[PDB]
Homo-oligomer: A and B are copies of this chain.
Amino acid sequence: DYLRELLKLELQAIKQYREALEYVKLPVLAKILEDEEKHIEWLETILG
């Protein structure tokens, strides 16, 4: 369950960073989004 909570937080965050990126095109937001996409891939892998 702690694992599903983490995936929920990453999906939660990916949605907000996308909205931020839409509002202002600061490249560092895209860079963070690439990291978060990796985090989601890793948590999905831990969940099998």
Check: A46 CB closer than 8 A to any chain B CB: yes
User: Known: A16-B9, A35-B35. Contact between A26 and B46, CB under 8 A?
Assistant: yes
- 10 more contacts with CB within 8 A, not counting A6-B16, A26-B46, A35-B35, are A2-B20, A3-B20, A5-B16, A6-B20, A9-B9, A9-B16, A32-B39, A32-B42, A35-B38, A35-B39
Q: Which residue of B lies closest to A35 (CB)?
A: B35
List of B residues within 8 angstroms of A10 by Cβ: 13
Contacts from A to B (Cβ < 8 Å): 2-3, 5-6, 9-10, 12-13, 16-17, 19-20, 23, 26, 28, 31-32, 35, 38-39, 42, 46
